[model samples]
Target: NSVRDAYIADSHNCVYECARNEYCNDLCTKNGAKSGYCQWVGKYGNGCWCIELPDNVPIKVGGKCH
Candidate 1:
């Protein structure tokens, strides 16, 4: 499996406006991501960049929504 920068291409803006990295993690999950972080992402400030999940295998993501 492999992962890459969580670039919210669909949004074209940013992830979730978060002040806690804790919530960011789930936001990523809620949005078809492995995980996320609240950090300096510029433009939109410290936002949650949903860490893109793996494509090497078809797994995880039960019935949740991002």
Candidate 2:
């Protein structure tokens, strides 16, 4: 079985965090991120889309949110 490490909220307001999340730590998750890929959105009227998860796929959210 596969488990979602986290989810990026639509509140992200950026494509990088939504798709690849390359710049997560500094750009996306820096301001407010609950989990690795999960960002806070309740206050921003934003939500996240459901995505399929893979097995033990190591990832790094770096670069930029834009």
Q: What's the TM-score of every candidate structure?
A: 0.51, 0.22
Model 2 residue pairs with clashes: 22-62, 23-62, 23-64
In angstroms, give how far residue 16 of model 2 lies from its true place: 4.6
Q: Compared to the true structure, candidate 1 yields what TM-score?
A: 0.51
Error of 2 at 49 (Å): 12
Instruction: State the lDDT of candidate 2 residue by residue for 1-66, as single tens digits.
Output: 463433343332333333333444433344343334323353222223224333343222333333
> Alpha-carbon error at 11 in model 2, in Å?
4.0
Error of 2 at 17 (Å): 5.1
Cα-based lDDT for every prediction? 0.54, 0.35
Q: Candidate 2: RMSD over Cα atoms? A: 11.8
For all the candidates, what are their Cα RMSDs to the real structure? Answer: 8.6, 11.8
Ten residues in sequence with the least summed lDDT for candidate 1: 57-66
Q: Which candidate has the highest lDDT of all? A: 1
Q: Candidate 1 local accuracy as lDDT?
A: 0.54
Put down candidate 1 lDDT per residue, 1-66, tens digits, no spaces.
466555333322324467888787776676567777776655445566666744432222323223
